[PDB]
Write an enzyme that holds these catalytic residues in place. Structure first.
Site, PDB file in Angstrom:
ATOM      1  N   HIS A  62       0.877  -1.223   0.000  1.00 19.28           N
ATOM      2  CA  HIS A  62       0.000   0.000   0.000  1.00 19.28           C
ATOM      3  C   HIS A  62       0.893   1.245   0.000  1.00 19.28           C
ATOM      4  CE1 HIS A  62      -3.149  -2.823   0.564  1.00 19.28           C
ATOM      5  NE2 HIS A  62      -2.573  -3.284   1.674  1.00 19.28           N
ATOM      6  N   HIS A  92       4.872   6.648   7.475  1.00 19.76           N
ATOM      7  CA  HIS A  92       4.658   6.302   6.066  1.00 19.76           C
ATOM      8  C   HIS A  92       4.149   7.543   5.384  1.00 19.76           C
ATOM      9  CE1 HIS A  92       0.782   5.746   8.014  1.00 19.76           C
ATOM     10  NE2 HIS A  92       0.276   6.257   6.857  1.00 19.76           N
ATOM     11  N   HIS A  94       1.570   9.106   1.925  1.00 18.65           N
ATOM     12  CA  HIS A  94       0.599   8.933   0.851  1.00 18.65           C
ATOM     13  C   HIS A  94       0.966   9.957  -0.218  1.00 18.65           C
ATOM     14  CE1 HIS A  94      -2.190   6.730   3.636  1.00 18.65           C
ATOM     15  NE2 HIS A  94      -1.473   7.442   4.537  1.00 18.65           N
ATOM     16  N   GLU A 104      -3.985  13.347   1.803  1.00 23.66           N
ATOM     17  CA  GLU A 104      -5.292  12.822   2.287  1.00 23.66           C
ATOM     18  C   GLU A 104      -6.093  13.976   2.869  1.00 23.66           C
ATOM     19  OE1 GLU A 104      -4.249   9.147   4.481  1.00 23.66           O
ATOM     20  OE2 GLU A 104      -5.052   8.314   2.612  1.00 23.66           O
ATOM     21  N   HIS A 117       2.644  10.609   7.583  1.00 18.14           N
ATOM     22  CA  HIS A 117       1.929  10.240   8.807  1.00 18.14           C
ATOM     23  C   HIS A 117       2.912   9.591   9.759  1.00 18.14           C
ATOM     24  CE1 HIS A 117      -2.085  10.110   6.498  1.00 18.14           C
ATOM     25  NE2 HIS A 117      -1.728  11.344   6.886  1.00 18.14           N
ATOM     26  N   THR A 196      -6.848   6.099   7.974  1.00 20.08           N
ATOM     27  CA  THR A 196      -7.318   6.412   6.626  1.00 20.08           C
ATOM     28  C   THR A 196      -7.217   5.215   5.716  1.00 20.08           C
ATOM     29  OG1 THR A 196      -5.200   7.069   5.785  1.00 20.08           O
ATOM     30  CG2 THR A 196      -6.514   8.807   6.878  1.00 20.08           C
TER      31      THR A 196
END
Ligand SMILES: COC(=O)c1cc(S(N)(=O)=O)c(Cl)cc1S(=O)(=O)c1ccccc1
Ligand code: NA
Ligand code: NA
Ligand code: NA
Ligand code: NA
Ligand SMILES: [Zn+2]
EC number: 4.2.1.1
Length: 258
Positions: A62, A92, A94, A104, A117, A196
């Site tokens: 992911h 991590h 996104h 996000e 995050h 999330t």
């Protein structure tokens, strides 16, 4: 047919395996800066990362996680809106397929290129798996990334990614100091929300810094060379691994500043 980020298994599908996806405190959200209320009772955030022990970096299919040793009282977040001590377990990101998307959270509908995050668990619950079952179990420090000047403290992360290209690869990653990822200012917004990603548990106090960090175009291009697939499977570039903003419902976003 597992969850992911595609039309066949992306965010709009997650509610069928995880019905909490349509819950009352989901994340991320749009932060309407004009409606967020300054809360003079909010404390400066205390980020104490001097003794943080990173161990490893993992492509989980992911994103990638940079993992920390959380077995002692090292690398904690406290203060801010929190009434307890939260221990860093991993960070991590996104990010998007282009610079105009990837975060996000959004700010007055603005999407940043990526979002970091830093995940922390409330030590009152003894470890992470028990914490995620509690409404105040986690505190996530969220930091926006924009593309401009490089972030020197990110380059060690960006240079190990070729060794974890595909899902399930990991590499040793010791001595990484997450202080190099923080902006100058610790001004923040905060609100109660959720993971999330599946399982979407409603266990997170979100603390979103107002000041983004700058990374270079070359740094974010290396994130977009990762793969969601495993070794030996057709390449699916790891991009657009963000969930869209969710309904704010009955919540107030509080500002530490203005
Ligand atoms: C698969 O889960 C994640 O990707 C994720 C993502 C977040 S996020 N994206 O909300 O920071 C958190 Cl706090 C924490 C996690 S997580 O710690 O990886 C996780 C995984 C399984 C169950 C519960 C928590
Ligand atoms: Na306001
Ligand atoms: Na230990
Ligand atoms: Na644990
Ligand atoms: Na909505
Ligand atoms: Zn995340």
């Amino acid at each position: 047919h597992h969850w992911g980020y595609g039309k066949h298994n992306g965010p709009e599908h997650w509610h069928k395996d995880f019905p909490i996806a349509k819950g009352e405190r989901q994340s991320p959200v749009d932060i309407d800066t004009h409606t967020a209320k300054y809360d003079p009772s909010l404390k400066p955030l205390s980020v104490s990362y001097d003794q943080a022990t990173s161990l490893r970096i993992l492509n989980n299919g992911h994103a990638f996680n940079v993992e920390f040793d959380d077995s002692q009282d090292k690398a904690v977040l406290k203060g801010g809106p929190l009434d307890g001590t939260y221990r860093l377990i991993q960070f991590h990101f996104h990010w998007g397929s282009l610079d105009g998307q990837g975060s996000e959270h959004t700010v007055d509908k603005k999407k940043y290129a990526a979002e970091l995050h830093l995940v922390h668990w409330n030590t009152k619950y003894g470890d992470f798996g028990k914490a995620v079952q509690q409404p105040d179990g986690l505190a996530v420090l969220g930091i926006f990334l924009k593309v401009g000047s490089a972030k020197p403290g990110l380059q060690k992360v960006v240079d190990v990614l070729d060794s974890i290209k595909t899902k399930g690869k990991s590499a040793d990653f010791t001595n990484f100091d997450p202080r190099g990822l923080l902006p100058e200012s610790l001004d923040y917004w905060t609100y109660p929300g959720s993971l999330t990603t599946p399982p979407l548990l409603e266990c997170v106090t979100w603390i979103v810094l107002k000041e983004p960090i700058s990374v270079s175009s070359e740094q974010v291009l290396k994130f977009r060379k990762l793969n969601f697939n495993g070794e030996g499977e057709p390449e699916e570039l790891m991009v657009d691994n963000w969930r869209p903003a969710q309904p704010l419902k009955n919540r107030q976003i509080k500002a530490s500043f203005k």
